[PDB]
Structure 1
Amino acid sequence: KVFGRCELAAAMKRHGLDNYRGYSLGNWVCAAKFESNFNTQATNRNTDGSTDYGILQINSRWWCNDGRTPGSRNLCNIPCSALLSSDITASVNCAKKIVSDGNGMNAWVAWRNRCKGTDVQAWIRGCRL
């Protein structure tokens, strides 16, 4: 599924991401825009052999099992394919674990480089929330 901006904002709000660990909703919508262009099916392979999955591009070396990232952990206890679903529940639940892990949203390179320190509330302007 390719979400609309406000559609995704509303879905993320319902799943408790607004102000989760202090990150306003706009941060999460911004991170999803630049990680995946709002496409739940996005995948990208990294040089270390791990793969990033889904709307928040969650990485298979630490967070999910895809059967081909040797010596990886599965800290979210889920197959990486669960993260590609049109239902964002699995991605959100896993992201909550990632963002609690100490480095905050800096775990998302696109958030660090393209969202951090910007006017992120712009990502939710015009949305009925």
Structure 2
Amino acid sequence: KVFGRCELAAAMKRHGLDNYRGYSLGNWVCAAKFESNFNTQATNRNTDGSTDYGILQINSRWWCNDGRTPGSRNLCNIPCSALLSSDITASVNCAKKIVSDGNGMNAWVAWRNRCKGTDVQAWIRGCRL
């Protein structure tokens, strides 16, 4: 599923991401924008052999099982395929664990490089939430 901007913001809010660990909703929408362009089916292979899945491009190195990432963990206790669903529940729940891991949203390199310190509220501007 490719979400609309305001559509995703609403779903993320419904699932408790809005201000989770102090990160406003706009931060989450911005991260999703640059990670996946709002496409739940987005996948990308990493140089180390791990793969990133879903709207927030969650990495199989630590967070999910895909059966093809040697030496990895599955800390969210989910198949990485679950992160590609039209229903964002598994992505959100796993993202809450990742953002709690100590580096906050810096876990998402793209958030650090493209969202951090910017006017992230623009991402939820106009949305009925």
TM-score, scaled to structure 2: 1.00
Q: CA deviation at 1:104?
A: 0.1
Partner residue of 2:94? 94
Q: How many residue pairs are counted as aligned between the two chains?
A: 129
Deviation beyond 6 Å, 4+ runs, structure 1 = none
**1:19-51 deviations in whole A, cap 9, x for unaligned?**
000000000000000000000000000000000
Distance in 1 separating the partners of 2:114 and 2:71 = 31
Distance in 2 separating the partners of 1:16 and 1:75 = 20
Q: CA deviation at 1:119?
A: 0.3
Seq. identity, %: 100
Q: Unmatched 5+ residue regions in structure 1?
A: none
Distance in 1 separating the partners of 2:62 and 2:73 = 5
SS of the residue corresponding to residue 20 of structure 1 reads: coil
Q: Unmatched 5+ residue regions in structure 2?
A: none
SS of the residue corresponding to residue 52 of structure 1 reads: strand
SS of the residue corresponding to residue 105 of structure 2 reads: helix
Partner residue of 2:113? 113
Partner residue of 2:18? 18
Aligned CA RMSD, in angstroms, stands at: 0.2
